[PDB]
């Protein structure tokens, strides 16, 4: 989920613009409870991993 004070000015869809090249080819191990940061597009925005179905190490 996005966080409000970093999306006060940006709008539209953030999925293909930010999140799709972020997890591409890097094989990033994420966990329920972490907050990462994505730069690009004249703005840096953060995302908190809210809910994952499997075990937290994945």
């Amino acid at each position: 989920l996005p966080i409000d004070d970093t999306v006060e000015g940006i709008t539209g869809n953030l999925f293909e613009v930010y999140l799709k090249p972020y997890f591409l080819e890097a094989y990033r191990p994420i966990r329920k409870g972490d907050i990462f940061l994505v730069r690009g597009g004249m703005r840096a925005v953060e995302f908190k991993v809210v809910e994952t179905d499997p075990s937290p190490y994945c």
Partner: protein
Amino acid sequence: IVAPDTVIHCEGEPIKREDEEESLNEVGYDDIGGCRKQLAQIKEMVELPLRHPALFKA
């Protein structure tokens, strides 16, 4: 289109304006001469932040 055949009536009292109407009390860009480069620079600095505050905030 105003034709020369069309008669022009000027009968009536000098009336006041609507309150939202502007006048020559304020000054526009035409009343300034000889400093086109500096006026261009001030337009570049000032217009784009003030005309579009939400866009420039984004």
